[PDB]
């Protein structure tokens, strides 16, 4: 059902994702005979037989948590991006300015509202190093 009435422009070496069946699944477009990039027509025979391969160590996984796993808190996630994104995107420039950044951000709320999730998502999406201390 994925490529039917879609004609999705694909390229050699891209990872794509399909949802359905109480599980998400990954694939990688390994080889195109009109190399490298094309549009999947009904002409294309699609080889789906073989071994599921290993990852490269710098392939960013899709089971990680990003900003699309969080719902219902648009405003607060905007505030945390404004506080945090600039001092971690541009450390050298921001050191060269001479302004102090924030250094202590206390998230609080009732139990079960997704605070560990928000911190994990900001860490994955900025790409900073992340160390977790548990109480």
């Amino acid at each position: 059902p994925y490529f039917l009435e879609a004609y999705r422009p694909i390229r050699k070496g891209d990872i794509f994702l399909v949802r359905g069946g109480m599980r998400a699944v990954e694939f990688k477009v390994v080889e195109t005979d009109p190399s490298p990039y094309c549009i999947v027509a009904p002409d294309t025979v699609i080889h789906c037989e073989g071994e599921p391969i290993k990852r490269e160590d710098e392939e960013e996984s899709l089971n990680e948590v990003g900003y699309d796993d969080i719902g219902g808190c648009r405003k607060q996630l905007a505030q945390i991006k404004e506080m945090v994104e600039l001092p971690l995107r541009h450390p050298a420039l921001f050191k060269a300015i001479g302004v102090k950044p924030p250094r202590g951000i206390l998230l609080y709320g009732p139990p079960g509202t997704g605070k560990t999730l928000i911190a994990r998502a900001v860490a994955n999406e900025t790409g900073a190093f992340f160390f977790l201390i548990n109480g």
Binding site: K95, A96, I97, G98
Partner: protein
């Protein structure tokens, strides 16, 4: 018993080369508010400044900025001799150099932004 040995107090004016004096001390000391004075300090280090007037300034005290105060090796409550010197001429070549700690962020120009 000389009227030129003076003692530093806190500064009110914001300039880096302006000292202040009260008017009877200037009139005794033969100074006008356009003069160019010479100031001696500890470890034989001296400085040159433009004097102006004040009424909130006392006679036993001179008011100077922190930049002049640190170029004389003087702290608050120390002794400094002042003397008029119209022996100051103009210049031809003046060679300046930044100090290494304050210039670690910016690179590029320094003449037109700062000194101009």
């Amino acid at each position: 018993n000389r009227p030129n040995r003076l003692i530093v107090d806190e500064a009110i004016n914001e300039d880096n080369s302006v000292v202040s004096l009260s008017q009877p001390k200037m009139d005794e000391l033969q100074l006008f508010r356009g003069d160019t004075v010479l100031l001696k300090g500890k470890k034989r280090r001296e400085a040159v400044c433009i004097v102006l007037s004040d009424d909130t300034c006392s006679d036993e005290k001179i008011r100077m900025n922190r930049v002049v105060r640190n170029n004389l090796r003087v702290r608050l409550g120390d002794v400094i001799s002042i003397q008029p010197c119209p022996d100051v001429k103009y210049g031809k070549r003046i060679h300046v150099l930044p100090i290494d700690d304050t210039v670690e962020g910016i690179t590029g120009n320094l003449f037109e932004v700062y000194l101009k």
